Design an enzyme around this catalytic site. Structure first.
Site, mmCIF file in Angstrom:
data_model
loop_
_atom_site.group_PDB
_atom_site.id
_atom_site.type_symbol
_atom_site.label_atom_id
_atom_site.label_comp_id
_atom_site.label_asym_id
_atom_site.label_seq_id
_atom_site.Cartn_x
_atom_site.Cartn_y
_atom_site.Cartn_z
ATOM 1 N N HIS B 305 0.965 -1.214 0.099
ATOM 2 C CA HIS B 305 0.080 0.066 -0.005
ATOM 3 C C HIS B 305 0.854 1.440 -0.009
ATOM 4 O O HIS B 305 1.838 1.426 0.708
ATOM 5 C CB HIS B 305 -1.099 0.088 1.019
ATOM 6 N N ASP B 362 -7.224 -5.294 3.352
ATOM 7 C CA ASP B 362 -7.842 -5.787 2.371
ATOM 8 C C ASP B 362 -7.834 -7.362 2.016
ATOM 9 O O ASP B 362 -8.593 -8.277 1.666
ATOM 10 C CB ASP B 362 -8.021 -5.284 0.887
#
Lengths: 426, 426, 142
Positions: B305, B362
């Site tokens: 990320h 996620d």
């Protein structure tokens, strides 16, 4: 050409920042490195920040300059037609006949919208504002045209652009027919972009519809004069959403909503409140409403514009077209002589003269559209429909640059880290 | 306490600029009035430009810190619930028992979607992606709830806010039901946000449905952990669209399209191409697909990320929850043991350690959703559903600031003015 | 006297009085009631007709439009000269009017139609089809 080389930023240690030069307009200071060097500027509204490099539209607000690919808006408005302007805005150059025929043929090849989408319209209440239906339909397109959503694939962007370009007038006209309860009209291959829209707007299956050459050119002009207006609010939204991956259809829909924002953002009676006080104080045939209404001035009604100091360059050709149209639709517009008086008021009233509330392009656009029988609820739909090409070009330009994702900073002024202890028990 | 005083810019002469201080993070160089001198900065993507002052969420990337109103994310996901967290984000403090109960009452009373909106669902294709359907419906909300579109009206904003918070779950679940051919389920005021959502997702008229407490709690934490994530591209899209005055619903609809952007923005086989090469080279039960797929790495599949350096502070509770869920849904997830192997690979494979492709929230959220029987196409719908309160929080903050309209500059590098002469005849 | 009826009777008993001329015997009332309740549902095809009307339409205009369309459905009781026909048509109107009225309201506000409940009184059942929501069971204040 004084310091188009360098400049310095001093906080604790002097940082060398390159000055970038444009071909027109002001120069800019390249600060794409300050961030990593631990330096952030603060510009809510982005008024001192250039969000991108662009070659599409140039505006010189104070001197009333508006250029699309270097061409003055007046020339394009009087010497071109909406489709050629589309080509220019999209490709950067006027088209040769061959390039133009090929372009026009591609557009013509995709004007019809999927019949299932036509079934979405009927789920909207008949009483829906036509603009809410437009945002609604445009935002549903991605579910139907799911094969042209790869924003990173150049073939998809092309497909999408032609899809949006080809189908907007189809959808815009359907929004109107739906709101008035008349049957939808299919695109006509043998008609011009503008003649087709008029036909889709007003023809019925009860009689042949005659496209008036005068109104056809006037519509064409309204469209050209609304093709693009640089980095305004709605285009910032299109570029911003786009840089975050969002599919092309969603981007235009966001632009459409951003464009009519001012219309409902007003107050359920912003420029409407006094549109009701034309019944008790109508003793004076003008200053009763649309002459005493604007307490809170508006460029939405066609007066003034934050972008242009003394006048709106787009209003020049539009005003002339306005004369031609009223001088054609004969005895049906004479009542709409107030227009001459509103203009008179905007030009000679100390208030307007002071706060520069000159009539802008939409003042003359409205008179024409009103004279054409088109309802005001459709005015923004037609503008967005036309502005769609400008949105496409910018979105595409954003994607050729390398889709620099919008990831701004914030100045955090909230709480410092603190512990949470549930105050509730439910 | 260093250059907390001033700073200067020099092109050939000096200019002094204030340097506002934040309560956390970097301070900024105020450049608001620079534009009123002609001097502009250049910063595509705004990564060196603070676009606003905020008090909602604070993130320190390298430290792996995520705060919401000062409250650490781990503390909220563990000891709060989604509505209380919604209250915190929207109000700035944890609620009083009386404040929470009032907030809750209101949210529940408006969870139903107008019956006419339901019809709109039926005009979409059954094969359409739920996410595309979710966008299409949200963007059409303004054509119905036309009684709360004036962004300048605080009553309007609060009502629009509440309608979104209450209705998003109902909307999300209907997309799922519609996608699989099951009847829509009405909200139940007796169930919690998370329980009521799972009910509208899985309930069938065939028999009453009972939500597992462990599953309910697991879904609640999935929502909490996706409630907000500061000034990312999708939130900045919401803020930018709202600054122009786009109605509340239109703004939320854009943040959604913007949120799944990466999912389709990636080739029709971006992270999908190798999801097909699991048939010819499946001789190795792992490195065959989801272990040789990522040529072009993705944080969309749960690895890495751009926001955090070493780890996602949100993934801590999600991993623990992930263990609890698999350790509950018994013999139905044992096959989904590859998760332990993907995690193993992401932690020990040199390719992942090199790219810092750590399992983000996620990844685990993904495991928990797959364990509950939810199709992957419904994951970002759920994340977007959860994310909407944060979007409402930033949009509302933007409006309390004075709605500073996004009107950026551009470095123009196109054609200087040139006359227009058309060479076509059509 | 109207004051006596509004105070000591109920709507169906008063309907019985108007239609029959005398107050009912307990056996007569119960029979009348049973019949009225068994036919409170409106043909599912009539419901579709509701959806062809605009949502902004006045409930009263919708109410007229639906009543005037009843003959195109219940075409089995139109001979006014046939007493059996008249009684059946009568009962269908008495039983269905409330269901019809409440649907106009629900349709006007965007809420789902509520089916009659045989366990509730005329007035209670009406208030239920007016205000009930699937979100939770509804309780009518006495």
């Amino acid at each position: 050409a004084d310091t188009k080389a360098k400049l310095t930023l001093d906080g604790d240690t002097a940082v060398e920042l390159d000055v970038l030069k444009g071909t027109l307009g002001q120069d800019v200071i390249d600060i794409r490195t300050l961030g990593s060097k631990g330096v952030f500027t603060f510009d809510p509204g982005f008024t001192s920040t250039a969000s991108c490099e662009s070659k599409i539209t140039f505006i010189d607000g104070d001197e009333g300059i508006l250029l699309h690919r270097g061409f003055p808006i007046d020339q394009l408005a009087t010497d071109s037609n909406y489709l050629e302007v589309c080509y220019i805005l999209l490709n950067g150059e006027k088209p040769t006949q061959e390039q133009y025929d090929e372009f026009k043929t591609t557009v013509t090849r995709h004007t019809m919208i999927h019949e299932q989408i036509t079934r979405l319209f009927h789920a909207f209440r008949r009483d829906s504002h036509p603009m809410a239906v437009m945002c609604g339909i445009t935002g549903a397109l991605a579910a139907f045209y799911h094969d042209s959503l790869d924003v990173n694939n150049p073939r998809h962007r092309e497909i999408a652009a032609f899809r949006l370009l080809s189908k907007m007038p189809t959808m815009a006209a359907m929004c109107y027919k739906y709101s008035i309860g008349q049957p939808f009209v299919y695109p006509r291959n043998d008609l011009s972009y503008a003649g087709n829209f008029l036909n889709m707007m007003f023809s019925t299956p009860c009689e042949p519809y005659e496209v008036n050459p005068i109104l056809e050119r006037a519509m064409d002009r309204i469209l050209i004069l609304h093709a693009d207006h640089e980095q305004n609010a709605s285009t910032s939204t299109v570029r911003t959403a786009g840089s975050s991956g969002a599919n092309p259809f969603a981007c235009i829909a966001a632009g459409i909503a951003s464009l009519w924002g001012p219309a409902h953002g007003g107050a359920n009676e912003a420029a409407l409140k006094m549109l009701e006080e034309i019944s008790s104080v109508k003793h004076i045939p003008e200053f009763v409403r649309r002459a005493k209404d604007k307490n809170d001035s508006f460029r939405l009604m066609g007066f003034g514009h934050r972008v242009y100091k003394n006048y709106d360059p787009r209003a020049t050709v539009m005003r002339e077209t306005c004369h031609e149209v009223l001088k054609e639709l004969g005895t049906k517009d004479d009542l709409l002589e107030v227009a001459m008086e509103l203009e008179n008021i905007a030009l000679n009233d100390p208030y307007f003269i002071e706060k520069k509330l000159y009539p802008n392009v939409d003042f003359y656009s409205g008179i024409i559209l009103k004279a054409m029988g088109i309802p005001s609820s459709m005015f923004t739909v037609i503008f967005a429909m036309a502005r769609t090409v400008g949105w496409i070009a910018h979105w595409s330009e954003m994607h050729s640059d390398g889709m620099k994702i919008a990831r701004p900073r914030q100045l955090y002024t909230g709480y410092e880290k603190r512990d949470f202890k549930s105050d509730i028990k439910r």
